[PDB]
Structures are given as structure tokens and as C-alpha cells.
Short mmCIF file of N, CA and C in Angstrom, two decimals:
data_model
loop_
_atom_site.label_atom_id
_atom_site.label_comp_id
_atom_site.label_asym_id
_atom_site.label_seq_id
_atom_site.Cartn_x
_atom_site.Cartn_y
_atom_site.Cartn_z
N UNK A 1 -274.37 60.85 205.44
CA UNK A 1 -273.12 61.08 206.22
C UNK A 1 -272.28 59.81 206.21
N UNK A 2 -271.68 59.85 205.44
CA UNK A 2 -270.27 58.67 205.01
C UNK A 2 -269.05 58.95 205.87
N UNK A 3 -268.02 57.93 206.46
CA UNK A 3 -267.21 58.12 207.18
C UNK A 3 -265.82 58.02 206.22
N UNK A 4 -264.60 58.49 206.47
CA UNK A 4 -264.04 58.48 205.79
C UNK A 4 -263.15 57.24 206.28
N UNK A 5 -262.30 56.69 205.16
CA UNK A 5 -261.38 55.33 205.75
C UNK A 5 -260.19 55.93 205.65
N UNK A 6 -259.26 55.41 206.78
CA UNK A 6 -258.10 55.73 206.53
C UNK A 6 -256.87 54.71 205.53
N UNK A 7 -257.48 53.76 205.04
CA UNK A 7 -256.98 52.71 204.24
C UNK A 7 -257.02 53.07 202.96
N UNK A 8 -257.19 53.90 202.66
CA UNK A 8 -256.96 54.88 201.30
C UNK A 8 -255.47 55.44 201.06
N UNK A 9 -255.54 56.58 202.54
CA UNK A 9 -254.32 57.23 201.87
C UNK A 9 -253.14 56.25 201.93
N UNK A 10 -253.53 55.15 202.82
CA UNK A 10 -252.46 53.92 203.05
C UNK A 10 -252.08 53.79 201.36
N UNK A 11 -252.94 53.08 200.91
CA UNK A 11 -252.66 52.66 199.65
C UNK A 11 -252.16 53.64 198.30
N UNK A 12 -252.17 54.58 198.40
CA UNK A 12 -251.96 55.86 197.66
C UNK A 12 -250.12 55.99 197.44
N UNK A 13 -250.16 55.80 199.45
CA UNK A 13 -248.52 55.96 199.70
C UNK A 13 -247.71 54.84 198.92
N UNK A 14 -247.87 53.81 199.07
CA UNK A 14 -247.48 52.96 198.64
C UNK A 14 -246.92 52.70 197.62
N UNK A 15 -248.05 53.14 196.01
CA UNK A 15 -248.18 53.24 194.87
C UNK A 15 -246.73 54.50 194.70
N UNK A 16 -246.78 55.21 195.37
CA UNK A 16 -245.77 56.45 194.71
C UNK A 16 -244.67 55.88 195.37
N UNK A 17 -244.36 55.12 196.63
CA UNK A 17 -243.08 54.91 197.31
C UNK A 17 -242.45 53.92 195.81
N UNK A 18 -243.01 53.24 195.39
CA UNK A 18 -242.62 51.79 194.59
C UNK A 18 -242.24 52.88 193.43
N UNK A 19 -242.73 53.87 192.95
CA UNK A 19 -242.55 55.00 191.94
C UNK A 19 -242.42 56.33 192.04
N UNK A 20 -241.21 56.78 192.56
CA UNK A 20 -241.16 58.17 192.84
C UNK A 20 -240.97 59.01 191.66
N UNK A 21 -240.26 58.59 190.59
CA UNK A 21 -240.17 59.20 190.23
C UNK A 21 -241.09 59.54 188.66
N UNK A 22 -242.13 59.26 188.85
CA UNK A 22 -243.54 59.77 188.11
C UNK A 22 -244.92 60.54 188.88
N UNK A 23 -244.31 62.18 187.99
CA UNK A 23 -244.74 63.34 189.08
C UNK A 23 -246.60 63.20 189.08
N UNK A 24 -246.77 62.42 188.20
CA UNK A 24 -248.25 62.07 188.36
C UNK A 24 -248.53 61.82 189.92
N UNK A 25 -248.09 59.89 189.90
CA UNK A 25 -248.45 59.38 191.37
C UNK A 25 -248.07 60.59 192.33
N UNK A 26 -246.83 61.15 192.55
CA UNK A 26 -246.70 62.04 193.64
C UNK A 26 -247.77 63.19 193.49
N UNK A 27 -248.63 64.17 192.80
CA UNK A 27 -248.60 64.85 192.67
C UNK A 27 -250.18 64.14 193.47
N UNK A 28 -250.71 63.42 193.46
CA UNK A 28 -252.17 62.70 193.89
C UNK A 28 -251.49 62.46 195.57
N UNK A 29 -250.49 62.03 196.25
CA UNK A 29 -249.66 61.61 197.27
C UNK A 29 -250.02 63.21 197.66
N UNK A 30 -249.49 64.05 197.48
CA UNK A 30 -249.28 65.75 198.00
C UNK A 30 -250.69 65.89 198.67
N UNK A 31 -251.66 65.51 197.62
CA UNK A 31 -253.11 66.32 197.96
C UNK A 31 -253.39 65.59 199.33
N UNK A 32 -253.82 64.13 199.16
CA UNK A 32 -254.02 63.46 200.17
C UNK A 32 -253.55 64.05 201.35
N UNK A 33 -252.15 64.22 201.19
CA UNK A 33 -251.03 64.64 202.57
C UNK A 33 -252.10 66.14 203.34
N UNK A 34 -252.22 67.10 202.82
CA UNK A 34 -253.00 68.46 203.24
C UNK A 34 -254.48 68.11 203.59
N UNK A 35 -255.34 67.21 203.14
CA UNK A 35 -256.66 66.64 203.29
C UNK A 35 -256.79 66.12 204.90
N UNK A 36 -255.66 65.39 205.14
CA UNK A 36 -255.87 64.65 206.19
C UNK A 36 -255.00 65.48 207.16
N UNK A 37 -254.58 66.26 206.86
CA UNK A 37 -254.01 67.74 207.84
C UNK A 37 -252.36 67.03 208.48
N UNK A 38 -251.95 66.96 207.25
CA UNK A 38 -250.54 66.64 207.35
C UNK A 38 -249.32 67.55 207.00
N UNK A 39 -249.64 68.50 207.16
CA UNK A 39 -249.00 69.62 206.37
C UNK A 39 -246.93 69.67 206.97
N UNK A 40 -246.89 69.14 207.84
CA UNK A 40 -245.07 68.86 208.03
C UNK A 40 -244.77 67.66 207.07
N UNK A 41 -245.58 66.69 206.76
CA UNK A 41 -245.45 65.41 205.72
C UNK A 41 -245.06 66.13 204.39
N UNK A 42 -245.80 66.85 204.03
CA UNK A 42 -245.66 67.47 202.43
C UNK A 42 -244.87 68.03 202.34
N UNK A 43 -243.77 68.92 203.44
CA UNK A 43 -243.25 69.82 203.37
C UNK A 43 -241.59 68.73 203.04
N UNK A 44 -242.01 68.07 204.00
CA UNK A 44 -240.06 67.24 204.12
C UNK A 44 -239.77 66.07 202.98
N UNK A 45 -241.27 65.99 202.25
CA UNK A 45 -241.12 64.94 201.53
C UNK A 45 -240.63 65.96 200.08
N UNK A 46 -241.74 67.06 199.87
CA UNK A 46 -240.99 68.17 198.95
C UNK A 46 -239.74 68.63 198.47
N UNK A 47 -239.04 68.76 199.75
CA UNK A 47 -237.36 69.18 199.54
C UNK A 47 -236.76 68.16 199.81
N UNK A 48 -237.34 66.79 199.43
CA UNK A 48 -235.97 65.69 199.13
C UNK A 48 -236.01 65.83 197.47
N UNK A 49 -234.72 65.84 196.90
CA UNK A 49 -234.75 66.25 195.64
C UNK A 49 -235.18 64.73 194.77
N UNK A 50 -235.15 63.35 195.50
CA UNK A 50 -234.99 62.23 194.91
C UNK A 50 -236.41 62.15 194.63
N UNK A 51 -237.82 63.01 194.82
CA UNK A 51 -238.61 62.94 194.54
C UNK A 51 -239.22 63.80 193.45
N UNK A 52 -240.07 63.38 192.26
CA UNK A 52 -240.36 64.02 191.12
C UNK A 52 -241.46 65.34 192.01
N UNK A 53 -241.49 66.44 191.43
CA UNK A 53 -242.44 67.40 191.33
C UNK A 53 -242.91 67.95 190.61
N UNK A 54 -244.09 68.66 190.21
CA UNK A 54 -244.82 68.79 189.20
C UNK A 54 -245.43 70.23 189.52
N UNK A 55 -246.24 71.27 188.69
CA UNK A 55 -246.78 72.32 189.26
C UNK A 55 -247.77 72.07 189.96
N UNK A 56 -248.52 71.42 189.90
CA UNK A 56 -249.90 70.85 191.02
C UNK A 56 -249.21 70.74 192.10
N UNK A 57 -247.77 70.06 192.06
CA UNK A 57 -247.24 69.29 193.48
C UNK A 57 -246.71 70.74 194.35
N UNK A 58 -245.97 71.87 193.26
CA UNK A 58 -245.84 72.97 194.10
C UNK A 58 -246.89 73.72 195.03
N UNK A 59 -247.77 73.69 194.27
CA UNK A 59 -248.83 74.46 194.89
C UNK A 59 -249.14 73.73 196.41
N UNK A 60 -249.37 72.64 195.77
CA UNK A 60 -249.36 71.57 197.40
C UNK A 60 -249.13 71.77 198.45
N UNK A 61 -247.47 71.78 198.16
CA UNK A 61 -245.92 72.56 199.04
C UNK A 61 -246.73 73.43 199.70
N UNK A 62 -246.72 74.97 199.08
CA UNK A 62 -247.45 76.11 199.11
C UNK A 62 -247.87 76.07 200.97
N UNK A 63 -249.67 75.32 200.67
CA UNK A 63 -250.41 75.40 201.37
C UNK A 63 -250.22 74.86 202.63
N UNK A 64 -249.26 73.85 202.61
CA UNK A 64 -248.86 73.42 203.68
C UNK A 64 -248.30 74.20 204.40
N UNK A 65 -246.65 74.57 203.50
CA UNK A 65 -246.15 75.66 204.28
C UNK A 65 -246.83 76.82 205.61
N UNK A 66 -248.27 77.06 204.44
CA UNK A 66 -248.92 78.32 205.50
C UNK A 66 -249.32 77.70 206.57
N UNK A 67 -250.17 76.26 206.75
CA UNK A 67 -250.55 75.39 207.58
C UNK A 67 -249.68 75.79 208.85
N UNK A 68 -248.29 75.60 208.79
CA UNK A 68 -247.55 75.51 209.52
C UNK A 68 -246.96 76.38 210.25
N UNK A 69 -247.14 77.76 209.46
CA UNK A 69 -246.65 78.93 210.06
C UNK A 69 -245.55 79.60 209.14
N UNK A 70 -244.92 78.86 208.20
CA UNK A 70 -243.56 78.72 207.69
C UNK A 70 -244.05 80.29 206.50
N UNK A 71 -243.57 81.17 206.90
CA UNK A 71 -244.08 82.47 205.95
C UNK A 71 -242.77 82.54 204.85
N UNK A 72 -242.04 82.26 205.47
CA UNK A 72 -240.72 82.71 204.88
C UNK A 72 -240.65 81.74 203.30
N UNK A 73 -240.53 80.10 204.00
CA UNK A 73 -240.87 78.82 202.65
C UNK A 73 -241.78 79.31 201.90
N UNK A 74 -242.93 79.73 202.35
CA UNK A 74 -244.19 80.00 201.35
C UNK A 74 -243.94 81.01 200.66
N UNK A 75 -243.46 81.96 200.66
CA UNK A 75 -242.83 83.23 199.75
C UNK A 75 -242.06 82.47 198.92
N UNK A 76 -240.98 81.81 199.22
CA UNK A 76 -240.51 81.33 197.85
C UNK A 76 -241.03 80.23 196.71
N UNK A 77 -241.45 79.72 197.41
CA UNK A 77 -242.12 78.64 196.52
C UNK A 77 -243.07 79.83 194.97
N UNK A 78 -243.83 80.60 195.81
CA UNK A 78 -244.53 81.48 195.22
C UNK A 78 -243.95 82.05 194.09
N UNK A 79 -242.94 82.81 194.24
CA UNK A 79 -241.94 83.41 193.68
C UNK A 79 -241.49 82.54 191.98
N UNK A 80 -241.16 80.94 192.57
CA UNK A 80 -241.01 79.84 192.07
C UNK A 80 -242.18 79.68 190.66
N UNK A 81 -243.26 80.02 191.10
CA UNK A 81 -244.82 80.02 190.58
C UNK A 81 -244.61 80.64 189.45
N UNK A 82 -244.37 82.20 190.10
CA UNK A 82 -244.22 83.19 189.02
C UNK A 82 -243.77 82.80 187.75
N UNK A 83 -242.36 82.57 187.67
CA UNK A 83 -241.72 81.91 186.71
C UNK A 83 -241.38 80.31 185.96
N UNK A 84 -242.26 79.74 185.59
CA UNK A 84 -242.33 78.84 185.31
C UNK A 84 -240.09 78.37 184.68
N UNK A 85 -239.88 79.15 183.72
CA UNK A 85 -238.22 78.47 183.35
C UNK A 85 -238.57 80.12 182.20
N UNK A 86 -239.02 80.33 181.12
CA UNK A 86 -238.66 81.54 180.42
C UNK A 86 -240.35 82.19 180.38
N UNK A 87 -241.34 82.07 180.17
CA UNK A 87 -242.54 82.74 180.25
C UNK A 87 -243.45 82.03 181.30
N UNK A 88 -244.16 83.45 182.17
CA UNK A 88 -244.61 83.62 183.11
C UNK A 88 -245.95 82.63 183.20
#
């Protein structure tokens, strides 16, 4: 039984603030955010457009959304899923 540190996701944030726009770092930033039951964090950081997203990072979005109650956000994102840009 290992405890978890909170000086992790510290350092995680950091790495993507200095680099937003490589959907890698963010897309590792998202997971963290839902792990530690942050699910309004993922959501407001999502719909700033100045941040890269990735399909891992949608899904992210996603789960939070439900976290929160938000039925309506989570339908579209989904929707979003479906269609990648021309094949499904």
C-alpha cells in the first residue's frame, strides 16, 4: 500500500503550461486532471482554443463532462468522435 504524491501532477502542469501547444504534453495533463477528480479543470481548460487537442484529449473532455452532470457537453463532444474530418 503506496501513497500517492501530490508533487507529480504539480510537475506534469508545468511541463505543458511552458508548451501548450504540443497535443502530446496536454493530452498526459487531461488524464492526470480526471485521476485526481478534477473534472471542472479539464472541462475549462478544453474549450480554451489556445490549447492543442488531440483524440485521447477528447475523450478526456468526455468523461469529465459526465463527472459533472453536464449531459448536454457530453453529447457533443461524442458526436465530435463519430466523425473524425471525412471517415468515421
Amino acid at each position: 500500500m503506496v501513497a500517492v504524491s501530490h508533487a507529480m501532477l504539480a510537475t506534469r502542469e508545468q511541463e505543458a503550461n511552458k508548451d501548450l501547444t504540443s497535443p502530446d504534453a496536454q493530452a498526459a495533463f487531461y488524464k492526470l486532471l480526471l485521476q485526481s477528480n478534477y473534472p471542472q479543470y479539464v472541462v475549462s481548460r478544453f474549450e480554451t482554443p489556445g490549447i492543442a487537442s488531440s483524440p485521447e484529449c477528447m475523450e478526456l473532455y468526455m468523461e469529465a463532462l459526465q463527472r459533472i452532470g453536464r449531459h448536454s457537453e457530453a453529447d457533443a463532444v461524442r458526436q465530435n468522435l463519430e466523425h473524425h474530418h471525412h471517415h468515421h
